[PDB]
Amino acid sequence: NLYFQSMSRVLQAEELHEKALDPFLLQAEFFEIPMNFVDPKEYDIPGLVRKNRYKTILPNPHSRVCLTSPDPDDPLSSYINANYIRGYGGEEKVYIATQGPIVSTVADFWRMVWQEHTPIIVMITTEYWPEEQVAYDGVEITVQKVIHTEDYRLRLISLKSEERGLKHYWFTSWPDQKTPDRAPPLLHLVREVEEAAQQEGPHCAPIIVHSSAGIGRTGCFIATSICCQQLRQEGVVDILKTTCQLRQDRGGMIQTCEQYQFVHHVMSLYEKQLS
Protein backbone atom coordinates (compact mmCIF):
# COMPACT_ATOMS: atom_id res chain seq x y z
CA ASN A 1 0.00 0.00 0.00
CA LEU A 2 2.95 2.29 -0.78
CA TYR A 3 1.40 5.01 -2.97
CA PHE A 4 -2.24 4.19 -2.35
CA GLN A 5 -4.49 1.70 -0.57
CA SER A 6 -4.65 -1.60 -2.51
CA MET A 7 -8.11 -3.06 -3.17
CA SER A 8 -9.15 -6.70 -3.50
CA ARG A 9 -12.00 -8.77 -4.90
CA VAL A 10 -11.35 -12.49 -4.79
CA LEU A 11 -13.30 -14.20 -7.57
CA GLN A 12 -14.29 -17.85 -7.49
CA ALA A 13 -15.27 -19.38 -10.86
CA GLU A 14 -18.99 -18.46 -10.90
CA GLU A 15 -18.37 -14.80 -10.07
CA LEU A 16 -15.39 -14.64 -12.47
CA HIS A 17 -17.54 -15.73 -15.42
CA GLU A 18 -20.29 -13.19 -14.58
CA LYS A 19 -17.79 -10.39 -13.76
CA ALA A 20 -16.21 -10.68 -17.23
CA LEU A 21 -19.70 -10.05 -18.68
CA ASP A 22 -20.63 -7.01 -16.51
CA PRO A 23 -19.08 -3.96 -18.20
CA PHE A 24 -20.98 -1.60 -15.87
CA LEU A 25 -19.34 -3.09 -12.75
CA LEU A 26 -15.99 -3.53 -14.52
CA GLN A 27 -15.81 0.20 -15.33
CA ALA A 28 -16.94 1.18 -11.81
CA GLU A 29 -14.23 -0.99 -10.30
CA PHE A 30 -11.52 -0.03 -12.84
CA PHE A 31 -11.90 3.73 -12.47
CA GLU A 32 -11.56 3.47 -8.67
CA ILE A 33 -7.94 2.32 -9.19
CA PRO A 34 -5.47 5.25 -9.22
CA MET A 35 -3.21 5.49 -12.31
CA ASN A 36 -0.28 6.35 -10.02
CA PHE A 37 1.59 8.20 -12.77
CA VAL A 38 4.74 10.06 -11.71
CA ASP A 39 4.96 13.83 -11.97
CA PRO A 40 7.43 14.52 -14.83
CA LYS A 41 9.04 17.20 -12.61
CA GLU A 42 10.33 14.38 -10.36
CA TYR A 43 13.02 13.91 -13.00
CA ASP A 44 15.37 16.85 -13.57
CA ILE A 45 17.92 15.29 -15.92
CA PRO A 46 19.43 17.04 -18.96
CA GLY A 47 19.02 14.87 -22.07
CA LEU A 48 16.12 12.87 -20.63
CA VAL A 49 13.86 14.08 -23.48
CA ARG A 50 15.61 11.62 -25.84
CA LYS A 51 14.99 8.65 -23.51
CA ASN A 52 11.19 8.69 -23.27
CA ARG A 53 8.73 7.97 -26.04
CA TYR A 54 5.98 9.80 -24.14
CA LYS A 55 6.83 12.79 -21.92
CA THR A 56 4.06 12.05 -19.37
CA ILE A 57 4.66 8.29 -19.08
CA LEU A 58 7.70 7.90 -16.83
CA PRO A 59 8.98 5.19 -14.48
CA ASN A 60 8.01 5.38 -10.82
CA PRO A 61 11.24 6.29 -9.03
CA HIS A 62 11.16 3.64 -6.26
CA SER A 63 10.97 0.67 -8.68
CA ARG A 64 12.82 2.07 -11.72
CA VAL A 65 15.58 -0.03 -13.25
CA CYS A 66 18.88 1.83 -12.75
CA LEU A 67 21.62 1.01 -15.28
CA THR A 68 24.71 0.55 -13.15
CA SER A 69 27.34 0.33 -15.95
CA PRO A 70 29.37 2.28 -17.05
CA ASP A 71 28.42 5.32 -14.92
CA PRO A 72 25.97 4.47 -12.09
CA ASP A 73 26.36 7.90 -10.47
CA ASP A 74 25.31 9.75 -13.66
CA PRO A 75 21.53 10.28 -13.73
CA LEU A 76 21.25 10.19 -17.56
CA SER A 77 23.56 7.18 -18.06
CA SER A 78 21.65 5.21 -15.42
CA TYR A 79 18.22 6.04 -16.91
CA ILE A 80 15.86 3.76 -18.76
CA ASN A 81 12.04 3.99 -18.91
CA ALA A 82 11.54 0.66 -17.15
CA ASN A 83 10.34 -0.65 -13.77
CA TYR A 84 10.80 -3.82 -11.81
CA ILE A 85 7.43 -5.52 -11.41
CA ARG A 86 6.45 -7.88 -8.59
CA GLY A 87 4.85 -11.14 -9.67
CA TYR A 88 2.40 -13.57 -8.08
CA GLY A 89 2.26 -13.31 -4.26
CA GLY A 90 4.46 -10.20 -4.37
CA GLU A 91 7.62 -12.02 -5.55
CA GLU A 92 10.23 -9.33 -6.32
CA LYS A 93 11.48 -8.59 -9.82
CA VAL A 94 9.53 -11.25 -11.70
CA TYR A 95 9.16 -8.88 -14.67
CA ILE A 96 10.51 -5.62 -15.98
CA ALA A 97 7.90 -3.50 -17.78
CA THR A 98 9.47 -1.06 -20.24
CA GLN A 99 8.63 1.08 -23.25
CA GLY A 100 9.41 -0.24 -26.72
CA PRO A 101 12.98 0.84 -27.52
CA ILE A 102 13.39 3.96 -29.67
CA VAL A 103 16.44 4.86 -31.81
CA SER A 104 18.07 6.68 -28.88
CA THR A 105 17.49 3.84 -26.35
CA VAL A 106 18.34 0.61 -28.27
CA ALA A 107 21.82 0.38 -26.68
CA ASP A 108 20.30 1.22 -23.25
CA PHE A 109 17.78 -1.62 -23.69
CA TRP A 110 20.58 -4.14 -24.34
CA ARG A 111 22.52 -2.74 -21.36
CA MET A 112 19.46 -3.61 -19.24
CA VAL A 113 19.13 -7.10 -20.75
CA TRP A 114 22.78 -7.87 -19.96
CA GLN A 115 22.68 -6.26 -16.50
CA GLU A 116 19.56 -8.18 -15.45
CA HIS A 117 20.52 -11.54 -17.05
CA THR A 118 17.07 -11.42 -18.65
CA PRO A 119 16.24 -14.85 -20.19
CA ILE A 120 13.03 -13.88 -21.99
CA ILE A 121 11.64 -10.79 -23.72
CA VAL A 122 7.92 -10.48 -24.50
CA MET A 123 7.19 -7.87 -27.19
CA ILE A 124 3.59 -6.94 -27.94
CA THR A 125 2.56 -5.00 -31.05
CA THR A 126 12.14 0.24 -33.91
CA GLU A 127 13.63 -3.17 -34.77
CA TYR A 128 16.24 -3.27 -31.99
CA TRP A 129 17.47 -6.81 -32.78
CA PRO A 130 19.75 -7.56 -35.75
CA GLU A 131 18.82 -9.50 -38.90
CA GLU A 132 21.79 -11.76 -38.01
CA GLN A 133 24.39 -10.10 -35.74
CA VAL A 134 25.18 -6.76 -34.03
CA ALA A 135 27.32 -5.64 -31.05
CA TYR A 136 26.52 -3.06 -28.35
CA ASP A 137 28.86 -2.09 -25.48
CA GLY A 138 30.94 -5.28 -25.53
CA VAL A 139 28.06 -7.75 -26.01
CA GLU A 140 27.59 -9.57 -29.34
CA ILE A 141 23.90 -10.19 -30.12
CA THR A 142 23.20 -13.04 -32.57
CA VAL A 143 19.77 -14.23 -33.75
CA GLN A 144 20.31 -17.99 -34.10
CA LYS A 145 16.79 -19.04 -35.16
CA VAL A 146 13.39 -17.55 -36.01
CA ILE A 147 10.36 -19.71 -35.18
CA HIS A 148 7.06 -18.56 -36.71
CA THR A 149 3.74 -19.56 -35.13
CA GLU A 150 0.14 -18.42 -35.77
CA ASP A 151 0.28 -15.53 -33.29
CA TYR A 152 3.94 -14.93 -32.39
CA ARG A 153 7.47 -15.05 -33.79
CA LEU A 154 10.11 -16.54 -31.47
CA ARG A 155 13.77 -15.60 -31.84
CA LEU A 156 16.45 -17.70 -30.16
CA ILE A 157 19.29 -15.27 -29.48
CA SER A 158 22.91 -15.63 -28.28
CA LEU A 159 24.49 -12.90 -26.12
CA LYS A 160 28.30 -13.15 -25.85
CA SER A 161 30.66 -11.09 -23.65
CA GLU A 162 30.58 -15.45 -21.08
CA GLU A 163 27.72 -16.56 -23.34
CA ARG A 164 24.01 -16.40 -22.53
CA GLY A 165 20.80 -17.44 -24.26
CA LEU A 166 17.73 -15.27 -24.72
CA LYS A 167 14.22 -16.00 -26.00
CA HIS A 168 12.44 -13.14 -27.79
CA TYR A 169 8.67 -13.59 -28.21
CA TRP A 170 7.09 -11.13 -30.61
CA PHE A 171 3.30 -11.30 -30.26
CA THR A 172 1.73 -9.75 -33.35
CA SER A 173 -1.92 -10.75 -32.67
CA TRP A 174 -2.96 -7.95 -30.25
CA PRO A 175 -6.67 -7.62 -31.06
CA ASP A 176 -8.47 -4.40 -32.01
CA GLN A 177 -11.64 -5.79 -30.41
CA LYS A 178 -11.07 -7.20 -26.91
CA THR A 179 -13.98 -9.64 -27.21
CA PRO A 180 -13.97 -13.16 -25.67
CA ASP A 181 -13.28 -14.81 -29.06
CA ARG A 182 -9.95 -12.89 -29.18
CA ALA A 183 -8.77 -14.28 -25.79
CA PRO A 184 -7.17 -17.61 -26.83
CA PRO A 185 -3.97 -16.24 -28.51
CA LEU A 186 -3.03 -14.12 -25.45
CA LEU A 187 -3.77 -17.04 -23.15
CA HIS A 188 -1.60 -19.32 -25.30
CA LEU A 189 1.31 -16.82 -25.21
CA VAL A 190 1.03 -16.38 -21.43
CA ARG A 191 1.20 -20.16 -20.94
CA GLU A 192 4.12 -20.56 -23.41
CA VAL A 193 6.08 -17.89 -21.54
CA GLU A 194 5.27 -19.53 -18.15
CA GLU A 195 6.71 -22.80 -19.44
CA ALA A 196 9.79 -21.06 -20.85
CA ALA A 197 10.29 -19.27 -17.51
CA GLN A 198 10.07 -22.52 -15.54
CA GLN A 199 12.63 -24.09 -17.92
CA GLU A 200 15.20 -21.48 -16.80
CA GLY A 201 15.46 -23.22 -13.44
CA PRO A 202 15.94 -21.79 -9.94
CA HIS A 203 16.06 -18.07 -9.23
CA CYS A 204 14.89 -16.98 -12.66
CA ALA A 205 16.06 -13.50 -13.69
CA PRO A 206 13.52 -10.80 -14.66
CA ILE A 207 11.39 -11.30 -17.78
CA ILE A 208 11.22 -8.14 -19.91
CA VAL A 209 7.79 -7.20 -21.27
CA HIS A 210 7.27 -4.24 -23.58
CA SER A 211 4.84 -2.49 -25.85
CA SER A 212 4.95 1.08 -27.21
CA ALA A 213 4.43 2.90 -23.86
CA GLY A 214 5.02 -0.28 -21.83
CA ILE A 215 1.86 0.09 -19.69
CA GLY A 216 -1.39 -0.95 -21.46
CA ARG A 217 -0.77 -4.19 -23.35
CA THR A 218 2.26 -4.81 -21.14
CA GLY A 219 0.00 -4.57 -18.05
CA CYS A 220 -2.54 -6.96 -19.62
CA PHE A 221 0.10 -9.56 -20.34
CA ILE A 222 1.60 -9.37 -16.83
CA ALA A 223 -1.76 -9.30 -14.99
CA THR A 224 -2.88 -12.37 -16.96
CA SER A 225 0.43 -14.15 -16.23
CA ILE A 226 0.13 -13.49 -12.47
CA CYS A 227 -3.56 -14.47 -12.34
CA CYS A 228 -2.95 -17.77 -14.19
CA GLN A 229 -0.56 -18.84 -11.39
CA GLN A 230 -3.10 -17.64 -8.81
CA LEU A 231 -5.88 -19.69 -10.42
CA ARG A 232 -3.78 -22.87 -10.53
CA GLN A 233 -2.45 -22.44 -6.99
CA GLU A 234 -5.47 -20.99 -5.15
CA GLY A 235 -8.50 -21.76 -7.36
CA VAL A 236 -9.47 -18.08 -7.39
CA VAL A 237 -8.31 -14.91 -9.15
CA ASP A 238 -7.96 -11.42 -7.69
CA ILE A 239 -7.58 -9.24 -10.81
CA LEU A 240 -8.33 -6.10 -8.78
CA LYS A 241 -5.52 -6.70 -6.27
CA THR A 242 -3.14 -7.73 -9.08
CA THR A 243 -3.91 -4.52 -10.98
CA CYS A 244 -3.35 -2.45 -7.81
CA GLN A 245 0.03 -4.21 -7.30
CA LEU A 246 1.02 -3.47 -10.91
CA ARG A 247 0.09 0.21 -10.57
CA GLN A 248 2.20 0.55 -7.39
CA ASP A 249 5.16 -0.72 -9.46
CA ARG A 250 4.54 1.26 -12.66
CA GLY A 251 1.92 3.97 -13.13
CA GLY A 252 -0.75 3.24 -15.76
CA MET A 253 -0.43 -0.57 -15.99
CA ILE A 254 -3.62 -1.66 -17.82
CA GLN A 255 -4.68 1.60 -19.49
CA THR A 256 -8.29 1.08 -20.55
CA CYS A 257 -11.40 -0.60 -19.18
CA GLU A 258 -11.59 -2.59 -22.42
CA GLN A 259 -8.16 -4.01 -21.50
CA TYR A 260 -9.33 -4.65 -17.92
CA GLN A 261 -12.40 -6.51 -19.23
CA PHE A 262 -10.11 -8.46 -21.63
CA VAL A 263 -8.08 -9.77 -18.68
CA HIS A 264 -11.37 -11.01 -17.18
CA HIS A 265 -12.32 -12.69 -20.51
CA VAL A 266 -8.93 -14.44 -20.62
CA MET A 267 -9.16 -15.60 -17.00
CA SER A 268 -12.76 -16.80 -17.43
CA LEU A 269 -11.60 -18.84 -20.45
CA TYR A 270 -8.63 -20.29 -18.56
CA GLU A 271 -10.89 -21.31 -15.65
CA LYS A 272 -13.12 -23.18 -18.11
CA GLN A 273 -10.10 -24.90 -19.64
CA LEU A 274 -8.80 -25.92 -16.20
CA SER A 275 -12.22 -27.11 -15.00
Residue numbers in the entry: -7 to -1, 258 to 375, 385 to 420, 423 to 536
Sentences from the study reporting this entry:
The ∼280 residue PTP catalytic domain consists of an α/β structure, and biochemical and structural studies have led to a detailed understanding of the catalytic mechanism (Barford et al., 1994; Zhang, 2002). Key features of the domain include the PTP signature motif, the mobile Trp-Pro-Asp “WPD” loop that in the closed conformation positions the conserved and catalytically important aspartate residue, and the phosphotyrosine recognition loop.
Structural comparisons of all available PTP structures identified four main WPD loop conformations: a closed state, an intermediate state, an open state, and an atypically open state present in STEP, LYP, and GLEPP1. The atypically open state is associated in STEP with a stabilizing 310 helix C-terminal to the WPD loop (Eswaran et al., 2006) and in LYP and GLEPP1 an extra turn of helix α3 following the WPD loop. On cocrystallization of a substrate-trapping mutant of STEP (Cys472Ser) with pY bound to the active site, the WPD loop was also present in the atypical open state, indicating that this conformation is stable and that substrate binding alone is not sufficient to induce loop closure as initially suggested based on apo structures and substrate complexes of PTP1B (Barford et al., 1998). In contrast, in structures with an open or atypical WPD loop conformation this water molecule was not observed or was significantly displaced, suggesting that it is a key part of the closure mechanism. In contrast, RPTPσ, the R7 group, and NT4 group PTPs were quite selective and showed a preference for a sequence derived from the phosphorylation site in N-cadherin (pY785), a reported substrate of RPTPσ (Siu et al., 2007).
